[PDB]
Design a protein around this ligand. Structure first.
Ligand SMILES: Cc1cc2nc3c(=O)[nH]c(=O)nc-3n(C[C@H](O)[C@H](O)[C@H](O)COP(=O)(O)O)c2cc1C
Ligand SMILES: C[As](C)(=O)[O-]
Ligand SMILES: [Zn+2]
Ligand SMILES: [Zn+2]
Ligand SMILES: [Zn+2]
Ligand SMILES: [Zn+2]
Length: 117
Protein backbone atom coordinates (compact mmCIF):
# COMPACT_ATOMS: atom_id res chain seq x y z
CA UNK A 1 0.00 0.00 0.00
CA UNK A 2 1.45 3.33 -1.06
CA UNK A 3 1.71 6.05 1.55
CA UNK A 4 1.77 9.71 0.45
CA UNK A 5 3.01 12.23 3.04
CA UNK A 6 4.10 15.73 3.83
CA UNK A 7 6.23 16.99 6.74
CA UNK A 8 7.33 20.55 7.64
CA UNK A 9 9.50 19.93 10.67
CA UNK A 10 10.29 16.24 10.17
CA UNK A 11 7.94 14.37 12.53
CA UNK A 12 5.75 12.84 9.82
CA UNK A 13 8.90 12.07 7.81
CA UNK A 14 10.36 10.23 10.77
CA UNK A 15 7.12 8.25 11.18
CA UNK A 16 6.97 7.14 7.54
CA UNK A 17 10.58 5.90 7.72
CA UNK A 18 9.56 3.67 10.69
CA UNK A 19 6.82 2.10 8.56
CA UNK A 20 9.12 0.59 5.94
CA UNK A 21 6.24 0.85 3.42
CA UNK A 22 6.27 2.25 -0.13
CA UNK A 23 6.14 6.01 0.45
CA UNK A 24 6.20 9.22 -1.59
CA UNK A 25 6.68 12.83 -0.55
CA UNK A 26 3.91 15.08 -1.96
CA UNK A 27 4.77 17.74 -4.51
CA UNK A 28 3.06 19.88 -7.12
CA UNK A 29 3.50 17.61 -10.14
CA UNK A 30 3.05 14.23 -8.42
CA UNK A 31 0.16 12.19 -9.79
CA UNK A 32 -0.78 9.07 -7.90
CA UNK A 33 -2.17 6.25 -10.07
CA UNK A 34 -2.85 3.70 -7.39
CA UNK A 35 -4.77 3.43 -4.12
CA UNK A 36 -2.96 5.33 -1.37
CA UNK A 37 -3.09 6.39 2.25
CA UNK A 38 -2.24 10.02 3.14
CA UNK A 39 -0.26 10.94 6.27
CA UNK A 40 -0.47 14.66 7.07
CA UNK A 41 0.41 16.86 10.02
CA UNK A 42 -1.93 19.50 11.48
CA UNK A 43 -1.19 23.22 11.27
CA UNK A 44 -2.57 26.41 12.66
CA UNK A 45 -5.98 26.07 14.34
CA UNK A 46 -6.85 22.48 13.40
CA UNK A 47 -6.06 22.88 9.71
CA UNK A 48 -4.84 20.82 6.81
CA UNK A 49 -1.52 22.24 5.48
CA UNK A 50 -1.98 24.12 2.21
CA UNK A 51 0.40 21.90 0.27
CA UNK A 52 -1.68 18.86 1.31
CA UNK A 53 -4.94 20.61 0.35
CA UNK A 54 -3.47 21.43 -3.05
CA UNK A 55 -2.33 17.87 -3.58
CA UNK A 56 -5.71 16.44 -2.60
CA UNK A 57 -7.52 18.79 -4.95
CA UNK A 58 -5.67 17.01 -7.74
CA UNK A 59 -5.31 13.40 -6.36
CA UNK A 60 -8.28 12.51 -4.27
CA UNK A 61 -9.71 9.86 -6.65
CA UNK A 62 -7.47 7.11 -5.26
CA UNK A 63 -7.36 8.25 -1.61
CA UNK A 64 -8.35 5.36 0.62
CA UNK A 65 -7.70 6.76 4.10
CA UNK A 66 -5.89 9.41 6.14
CA UNK A 67 -3.71 9.50 9.24
CA UNK A 68 -2.66 12.68 11.09
CA UNK A 69 0.29 13.60 13.19
CA UNK A 70 -0.59 16.20 15.84
CA UNK A 71 -0.29 17.05 19.51
CA UNK A 72 -2.71 16.33 22.31
CA UNK A 73 -2.06 19.77 23.76
CA UNK A 74 -4.55 20.89 21.03
CA UNK A 75 -7.33 19.09 22.92
CA UNK A 76 -10.32 18.44 20.65
CA UNK A 77 -8.33 19.85 17.71
CA UNK A 78 -5.92 16.90 18.05
CA UNK A 79 -5.30 15.57 14.52
CA UNK A 80 -8.19 17.65 13.16
CA UNK A 81 -6.62 17.64 9.67
CA UNK A 82 -7.64 13.97 9.50
CA UNK A 83 -11.23 14.84 10.58
CA UNK A 84 -11.50 17.42 7.82
CA UNK A 85 -10.12 15.10 5.09
CA UNK A 86 -12.18 12.11 6.24
CA UNK A 87 -15.40 14.13 6.31
CA UNK A 88 -14.83 15.82 2.96
CA UNK A 89 -13.63 12.84 0.89
CA UNK A 90 -15.56 10.19 2.79
CA UNK A 91 -12.54 8.04 3.64
CA UNK A 92 -11.64 6.57 7.02
CA UNK A 93 -9.32 8.00 9.62
CA UNK A 94 -6.64 5.29 9.73
CA UNK A 95 -5.09 6.68 12.90
CA UNK A 96 -4.01 9.78 14.81
CA UNK A 97 -0.64 9.94 16.56
CA UNK A 98 1.45 12.56 18.33
CA UNK A 99 4.61 13.99 16.88
CA UNK A 100 6.81 11.25 15.34
CA UNK A 101 4.78 8.47 16.90
CA UNK A 102 5.47 5.59 19.21
CA UNK A 103 6.24 2.02 18.19
CA UNK A 104 2.65 1.18 19.02
CA UNK A 105 1.44 3.93 16.67
CA UNK A 106 3.56 2.45 13.86
CA UNK A 107 2.19 -1.05 14.34
CA UNK A 108 -1.40 0.18 14.67
CA UNK A 109 -1.12 2.09 11.38
CA UNK A 110 0.05 -1.02 9.57
CA UNK A 111 -2.66 -3.19 11.10
CA UNK A 112 -5.33 -0.67 10.16
CA UNK A 113 -4.11 -0.34 6.56
CA UNK A 114 -4.22 -4.13 6.24
CA UNK A 115 -7.88 -3.96 7.30
CA UNK A 116 -8.79 -1.13 4.92
CA UNK A 117 -6.86 -2.10 1.79
C1 LIG B 1 1.58 26.44 14.96
C2 LIG B 1 1.19 25.08 15.29
C3 LIG B 1 -0.08 24.67 15.15
C4 LIG B 1 -0.42 23.30 15.32
N1 LIG B 1 -1.80 22.91 15.16
C5 LIG B 1 -2.12 21.64 15.60
C6 LIG B 1 -3.52 21.28 15.70
O1 LIG B 1 -4.49 22.04 15.42
N2 LIG B 1 -3.76 20.03 16.08
C7 LIG B 1 -2.77 19.10 16.37
O2 LIG B 1 -3.10 17.94 16.71
N3 LIG B 1 -1.48 19.44 16.28
C8 LIG B 1 -1.18 20.71 15.86
N4 LIG B 1 0.18 21.01 15.78
C9 LIG B 1 1.22 19.96 16.02
C10 LIG B 1 1.91 19.51 14.75
O3 LIG B 1 0.93 18.95 13.88
C11 LIG B 1 2.89 18.40 15.17
O4 LIG B 1 4.05 18.99 15.74
C12 LIG B 1 3.33 17.48 13.95
O5 LIG B 1 4.07 16.38 14.48
C13 LIG B 1 4.17 18.28 12.99
O6 LIG B 1 4.49 17.40 11.89
P1 LIG B 1 5.79 17.73 11.00
O7 LIG B 1 6.98 17.73 12.02
O8 LIG B 1 5.90 16.51 10.10
O9 LIG B 1 5.69 19.07 10.34
C14 LIG B 1 0.55 22.32 15.60
C15 LIG B 1 1.89 22.72 15.65
C16 LIG B 1 2.23 24.13 15.47
C17 LIG B 1 3.76 24.43 15.72
C1 LIG C 1 12.63 9.08 -0.69
AS1 LIG C 1 11.71 9.31 0.96
C2 LIG C 1 11.03 7.63 1.51
O1 LIG C 1 12.77 9.94 2.12
O2 LIG C 1 10.38 10.23 0.74
ZN1 LIG D 1 14.05 8.85 3.15
ZN1 LIG E 1 -3.49 26.19 -2.57
ZN1 LIG F 1 -6.00 25.47 -3.62
ZN1 LIG G 1 -12.01 22.73 21.09
Amino acid sequence: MLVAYDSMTGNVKRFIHKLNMPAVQIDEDLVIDEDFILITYTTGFGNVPERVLDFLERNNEKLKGVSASGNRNWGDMFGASADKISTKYEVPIVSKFELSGTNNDVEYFKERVREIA
